[PDB]
A paper describes a structure:
We describe a device and a method for changing the ambient solution of a macromolecular crystal. Examples are given of the equilibration of three different crystals to new solutions with exchange times ranging from 5 to 180 min. In each case direct transfer of the crystal to the new solution causes cracking, which is eliminated with gradient equilibration using the described device.
The structure was determined via molecular replacement to 2.2 Å resolution with a final refined Rwork and Rfree of 0.20 and 0.24, respectively. Comparing shorter 15 min equilibrations that did not produce visible cracks with longer (40 or 45 min) equilibrations that also did not crack showed the same mosaicity (within uncertainties). For the lysozyme and thermolysin crystals, just a 5 min gradient was sufficient to prevent visible cracking, while α-lactalbumin benefitted from more gradual treatments.
Residue numbers in the entry: 1 to 122
């Protein structure tokens, strides 16, 4: 399920300012992390990343590839492949508390300057 820029802007409302990250920063980051696809999957032979935020099964959620994951977000990773971002966002907030925005490498490289392109508001 591929979202669009101003759709994502609307659905990430609850992240506004949390951890000091603006909505433009999040719209920019998720564009460059998953292409706005809530069903994106990127997988090695040692880890899998899931959904709009590309949350990994090494420490954040558990799945079949790593049943022994620390599962810090306490949730099955496949809950990050549906169209309800509510539980995705709760897990994102936990990632922010523990390791900060730089879990998402796209943020520093591509989404910390020129945020005009990512606004869907006055
Ligand atoms: Ca979900």
């Amino acid at each position: 399920e591929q979202l669009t820029k101003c759709e994502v802007f609307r659905e990430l409302k609850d992240l506004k300012g949390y951890g000091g990250v603006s909505l433009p920063e999040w719209v920019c980051t998720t564009f460059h992390t998953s292409g706005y696809d809530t069903q994106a999957i990127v997988q090695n032979n040692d880890s899998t990343e899931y959904g709009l935020f590309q949350i990994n099964n090494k420490i954040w959620c558990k799945d079949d590839q790593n049943p022994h994951s620390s599962n810090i977000c306490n949730i099955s990773c496949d809950k990050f492949l549906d169209d309800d971002l509510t539980d995705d966002i709760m897990c994102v907030k936990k990632i922010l508390d523990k390791v900060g925005i730089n879990y998402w490498l796209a943020h520093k490289a591509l989404c910390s300057e020129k945020l005009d392109q990512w606004l869907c508001e006055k």
